[PDB]
Write a protein that binds this ligand. Sequence first.
Ligand SMILES: C[C@@H](Oc1cc(C(=O)O)ccc1-c1nn(C(=O)c2c(Cl)cccc2C(F)(F)F)c2ccc(Cl)cc12)c1ccccc1
Ligand SMILES: C[C@@H](Oc1cc(C(=O)O)ccc1-c1nn(C(=O)c2c(Cl)cccc2C(F)(F)F)c2ccc(Cl)cc12)c1ccccc1
Lengths: 259, 258
Amino acid sequence: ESADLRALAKHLYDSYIKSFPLTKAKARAILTGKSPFVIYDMNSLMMGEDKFKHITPLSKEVAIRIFQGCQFRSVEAVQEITEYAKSIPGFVNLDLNDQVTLLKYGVHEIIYTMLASLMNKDGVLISEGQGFMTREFLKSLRKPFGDFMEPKFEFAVKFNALELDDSDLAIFIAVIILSGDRPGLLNVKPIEDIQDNLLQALELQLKLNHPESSQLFAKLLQKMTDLRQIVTEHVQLLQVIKKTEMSLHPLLQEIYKDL
Amino acid sequence: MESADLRALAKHLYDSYIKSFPLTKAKARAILTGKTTDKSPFVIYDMNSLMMGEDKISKEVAIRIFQGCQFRSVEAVQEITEYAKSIPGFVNLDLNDQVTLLKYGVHEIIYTMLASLMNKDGVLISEGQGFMTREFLKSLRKPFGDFMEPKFEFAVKFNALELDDSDLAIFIAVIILSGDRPGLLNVKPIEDIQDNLLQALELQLKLNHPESSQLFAKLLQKMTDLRQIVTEHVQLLQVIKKTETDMSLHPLLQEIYK
Ligand SMILES: C[C@@H](Oc1cc(C(=O)O)ccc1-c1nn(C(=O)c2c(Cl)cccc2C(F)(F)F)c2ccc(Cl)cc12)c1ccccc1
Ligand SMILES: C[C@@H](Oc1cc(C(=O)O)ccc1-c1nn(C(=O)c2c(Cl)cccc2C(F)(F)F)c2ccc(Cl)cc12)c1ccccc1
């Protein structure tokens, strides 16, 4: 019934708000000016990290230091997504191996999605919106690091034209997690039953929240196409970096072994 | 914190412990105490049964066994690292401090969780498919025999507390989040997390062992015995390393011991 779907939408929105540091609503206010430190070149990076816990010297080259800052922030997001997943109705009741599998194969798609909340066409928010690193600075990093950053902005600009808000994104993120086609799942049926409920709720939410945005539901599901592919391209970009170039303390490499 | 937050944290950490560590104490105790047909381990107690064990479960035997321990210890480090990431606040810390905490914490945790696999007569191996007797390990030559036995000496005492996995999940989280590790940059955010974990441990032990008086203090005192056993272990491993050439250390362990 509608009430159950709206109750589920509100449940997920409230947990979404508690799980993530910077919401899209707050991020947009920063990006539009409605005041962060701007990193637009090398000198302003040095000042920005002398006046950001991901790009502090622990690798001396700047492009490497920014690249690992991306990894180290992605590890934080994984734990934030993991906590959020526990709030999705039915999730903690799934087989424990399947919970791990769902999170393992989903965090990459979800981090891409949620990164778009922090991006516009000119750059990206960092350190809870306290900093803003320009697209041009990231795109102009040397060797493959510059071509590693730009595809994220390319996706975000297109994803952002849907103009989803946080209440829409809370259900969408839950739909991605509850994907019954992840390899190695042991009991697909209850995962698909939950996702079917989340899809009903997302569908009703987009009708109520975007009544004049025709077939928005379909277009969001199509962005599942854009997401599986770029995560595919993303892993193959990492592999080229790993064989060509990065040394970290073996313990450090263990913390990041998944990203 | 309020009780409900203390209990919610204990449940979180237990869930994650189960996801992170393939062989729980609950399963280890089922194997060790037996009474079953399907879970029965093959028992390695001498040279011939080790050979038969490696057919259903080359260097000198003591080196082979040491490499056995070394290989599991690296896997354990990997499992502990994964578990640490799930502790609320740990990944948000300064990354040098994350390294520093794992660096000094893993050995104390390995000893703790090794006890789960031990009784006074031996230790489970190959994910519980095998059991290697204490006497066999202790009779290995040169320095390798006395290198094995102190682990059993601690475990017999630690196991007298009768902790279960839900207790141990919080206890090993307290160990990791120790503010007195050398070289830490930001002691205060680590201590705030530990105080939360210590509160959680205290309530967990009172609810789970309500007839066990001062179990909390006794467990914290065991975090003393661990500081010493880890000291003796590394001082034995260094001496072993500069007398035995037939051992390389895994690069992960080599960097931890530096
Ligand atoms: C702005 C900040 O980055 C993020 C912040 C957040 C957040 O706050 O929610 C989420 C993601 C990134 C970020 N990940 N990422 C990756 O490569 C990546 C991705 Cl998409 C998915 C999974 C794993 C990874 C990997 F493991 F490989 F890291 C980026 C690539 C380019 C850009 Cl511009 C941002 C990201 C940051 C910190 C430090 C320097 C620069 C930018
Ligand atoms: C039962 C199995 O050993 C462990 C299994 C596990 C596990 O499954 O969680 C964790 C630890 C050991 C184990 N490490 N270890 C060491 O010396 C050691 C330690 Cl504690 C910490 C860091 C580095 C090392 C070193 F590098 F030096 F190796 C042992 C010494 C004696 C005993 Cl009886 C067990 C261990 C095993 C496998 C194969 C043959 C015999 C025993």
